[PDB]
Design a protein around this ligand. Sequence first.
Ligand SMILES: N#Cc1ccc(CNC(=O)c2ncc3nc(N4CC[C@@H](O)C4)ccc3c2O)cn1
Ligand SMILES: [Mn+2]
Length: 198
Amino acid sequence: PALKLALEYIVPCMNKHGICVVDDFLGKETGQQIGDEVRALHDTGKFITWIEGKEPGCETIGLLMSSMDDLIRHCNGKLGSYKINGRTKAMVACYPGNGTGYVRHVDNPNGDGRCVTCIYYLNKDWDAKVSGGILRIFPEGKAQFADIEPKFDRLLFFWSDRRNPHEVQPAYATRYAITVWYFDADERARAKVKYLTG
Ligand SMILES: N#Cc1ccc(CNC(=O)c2ncc3nc(N4CC[C@@H](O)C4)ccc3c2O)cn1
Ligand SMILES: [Mn+2]
């Protein structure tokens, strides 16, 4: 139900707030397989990494990416004025439970093409009250900020640029999550001809 999901919620939610939470994305079963695939790769190398989506043992990881893409397609270029004509590979990251937080950062500070951050969380039965790991985002122009749990099967969207500085509180248990960044056509273009010449 991506067409309706995209147009009725994602688009207006992102255009109005610059952040959008979509719980219960792929359902429990689908998430567990992805969870297992990520764990397998972490525990032992196949042959902080980048997954194209077609690799052996990364099939359900690829499904997530296609699903994610599908939602973006069905936004039909209504996410701001962005023309999304591609994206990064999937960053499968392991975030430790060693009492370290991540310092407030902007994902895309220097206009490198990446216009939308998209994070899928893989932390089953996660309770931030015991395990921490809260994401705090500060929408630039707003009187409020948002604490967002890294809850299992949650999909989060937000603008990668200076509109969403974000920090992550410390965690006390290992965490898994998959991040993709969706490119703006004009911005990635400008960044390419900036790195060379510019
Ligand atoms: N679960 C969990 C979970 C999820 C995110 C975080 C905090 N991470 C971030 O905001 C975050 N934001 C932007 C990032 N950009 C990165 N990039 C994108 C382009 C590459 O050259 C470097 C790499 C890691 C990032 C990164 O880790 C902590 N725990
Ligand atoms: Mn970030």
